[PDB]
Amino acid sequence: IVGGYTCGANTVPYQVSLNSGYHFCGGSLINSQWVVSAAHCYKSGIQVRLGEDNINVVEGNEQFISASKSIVHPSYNSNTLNNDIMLIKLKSAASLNSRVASISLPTSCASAGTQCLISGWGNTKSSGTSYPDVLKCLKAPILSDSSCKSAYPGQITSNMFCAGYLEGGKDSCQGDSGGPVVCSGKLQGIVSWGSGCAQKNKPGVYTKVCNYVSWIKQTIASN
Numbered sequence: 691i692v693g694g695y696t697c698g699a700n701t702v703p704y705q706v707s708l709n710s711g712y713h714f715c716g717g718s719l720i721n722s723q724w725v726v727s728a729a730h731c732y733k734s735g736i737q738v739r740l741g742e743d744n745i746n747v748v749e750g751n752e753q754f755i756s757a758s759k760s761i762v763h764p765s766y767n768s769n770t771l772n773n774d775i776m777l778i779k780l781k782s783a784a785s786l787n788s789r790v791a792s793i794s795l796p797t798s799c800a801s802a803g804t805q806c807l808i809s810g811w812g813n814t815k816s817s818g819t820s821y822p823d824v825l826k827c828l829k830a831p832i833l834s835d836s837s838c839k840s841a842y843p844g845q846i847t848s849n850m851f852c853a854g855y856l857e858g859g860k861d862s863c864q865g866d867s868g869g870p871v872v873c874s875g876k877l878q879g880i881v882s883w884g885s886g887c888a889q890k891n892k893p894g895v896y897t898k899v900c901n902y903v904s905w906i907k908q909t910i911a912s913n
């Protein structure tokens with residue numbers, strides 16, 4: 691997260707870290723046995739880490755559970771990153787409490803101007819790599835579709851939205867991918883891509899979760 695702030699331990703109880711010997715993507719707990727992340731964060735050998743703050747120290751509250759299966763959206767396109775969403779089922783359910791809780795799926799899509807909270811252990815520099823130990827947060831508004839399309843002409847599908855600041859300085863970045871964009875207490879986006887991080891006129895592009903609710907629900911129901 692570039693230009694963000696330290697969240698505070700466990701203030702984002704739905705945030706998860708996908709780990710394969712190191713943190714590679716974030717994700718969101720949507721129920722005690724399922725997580726939502728981005729399809730491009732897929733790989734085998736994933737361990738889901740819940741209740742984390744400092745990812746390099748066991749401070750307590752952590753639950754490390756292996757993924758039983760990962761379901762990448764069948765229509766995911768790696769070249770355009772359209773349908774960049776993935777569901778991960780956990781081998782055993784997580785014990786939910788105040789430090790580990792699920793976030794709700796939306797009923798409606800959010801509007802431009804909606805303010806949301808983006809979090810993750812991704813890079814904090816736009817020029818170079820500096821990864822943090824604790825979770826970083828950023829408050830960012832959803833931009834209008836015309837501003838999004840003007841910034842990424844021909845690359846925005848109806849399953850994406852932009853959120854951020856056109857002046858640069860604040861954005862999500864590598865390592866934040868797969869994590870949550872929560873607005874008014876509902877999971878509205880998934881960190882997906884962007885051009886560099888926090889560059890002027892190149893905002894973050896997120897997966898528009900509201901378009902996948904029926905799919906997420908049907909898929910969980912049949913697995």
Ligand SMILES: NC(=[NH2+])c1ccc2[nH]c(-c3cc([C@@H](CC(=O)[O-])C(=O)[O-])cc(-c4ccccc4N)c3[O-])nc2c1
Pocket residue numbers: 714715730731732861862863864865866867881882883884885886887888893894895
């Ligand atoms: N500016 C943004 N809002 C933004 C948001 C999420 C991003 N995720 C990534 C991202 C970048 C990479 C690098 C890899 C490298 O330079 O070593 C790449 O391919 O350009 C990789 C991933 C990535 C790809 C597969 C699995 C986990 C990952 N973290 C990113 O999400 N960039 C991002 C940029």
Ligand SMILES: [Ca+2]
Pocket residue numbers: 742743744745746747748749750752
């Ligand atoms: Ca830890």
Ligand SMILES: [Cl-]
Pocket residue numbers: 839843844845
């Ligand atoms: Cl266009």
